[PDB]
From a paper:
To elucidate the molecular basis for LD recognition by α-parvin-CHC, we cocrystallized α-parvin-CHC with peptides representing the high-affinity ligands LD1, LD2, and LD4. The refined structures include residues 247–372 of α-parvin and paxillin residues 1–14, 141–155, and 262–274 for LD1, LD2, and LD4, respectively. All three LD motifs bind to the same binding site on α-parvin-CHC formed by the N-linker helix, the N-terminal part of helix A and the C-terminal part of helix G, which is consistent with our results from chemical shift mapping. Surprisingly, however, the orientation of LD1 is reversed compared to LD2 and LD4 in the corresponding crystal structures. Inspection of the resulting difference maps unambiguously confirmed that LD1 is oppositely aligned to LD2 and LD4. Note that these electrostatic contacts involve the conserved aspartate D+1 of the LD consensus in the case of LD2 and LD4, whereas D+6 and E+8 are utilized in LD1. Because of the reverse binding orientation D+1 of LD1 faces away from the binding site and toward R247 and H256 in a symmetry-related copy of α-parvin-CHC. On the basis of the probability of the solvation free energy gain upon contact formation, the latter interface is probably an artifact of crystal packing. Consistent with their similar binding modes, all three LD peptides, irrespective of directionality, impose similar conformational changes in the N-terminal region of α-parvin-CHC, whereas the protein core remains virtually unperturbed. Although our PRE experiments suggest bidirectional binding in solution, the refinement of different models against our X-ray data strongly indicate a predominance of the forward binding mode in the α-parvin-CHC/LD1 crystal.
Author numbering:
A (entry chain A): 246 to 372
B (entry chain C): 2 to 13
Write the structure that this text describes.
């Protein structure tokens, strides 16, 4: 089950900052268009909102308003948002993400990086 | 070769 992010955190932790930064630049390439900004991947994807918005921007979806919570007020809502974002990733043709939606909400860095990198790999050429 | 591949994407 072991991947490159396991190897990164175990053996090359000083390479984490360039990994963060490249992914931050990628997400803000799209989120800036909505006047939104990510400063830190540790916490700012946990409520599931930006992941949903990002998928809308990347695939050009008509995202149904009643399919996610724009201002989630609980663990469970934040849980429905990430799951819906995962749903939209798979709708575009991506494999089901490795992390459970709860791992994102609980601010697991590896899980956050994995989800964002797989979007980077697919959508790095999208203007 | 996964870490090599990962860093070629994100160190470019």
């Amino acid at each position: 089950e072991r991947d490159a992010f396991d190897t990164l955190f175990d053996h090359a932790p000083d390479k984490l900052n360039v990994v963060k930064k490249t992914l931050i630049t990628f997400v803000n390439k799209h989120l800036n268009k909505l006047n939104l900004e990510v400063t830190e991947l540790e916490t700012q994807f946990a409520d599931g909102v930006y992941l949903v918005l990002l998928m809308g921007l990347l695939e050009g979806y008509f995202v149904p308003l009643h399919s996610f919570f724009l201002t989630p007020d609980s663990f469970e809502q934040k849980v429905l948002n990430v799951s819906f974002a995962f749903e939209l990733m798979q709708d575009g043709g991506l494999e089901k993400p490795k992390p459970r939606p709860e791992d994102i909400v609980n601010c697991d860095l590896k899980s956050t990086l994995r989800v964002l990198y797989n979007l980077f790999t697919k959508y790095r050429n999208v203007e | 070769d996964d870490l090599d591949a990962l860093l070629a994407d994100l160190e470019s």
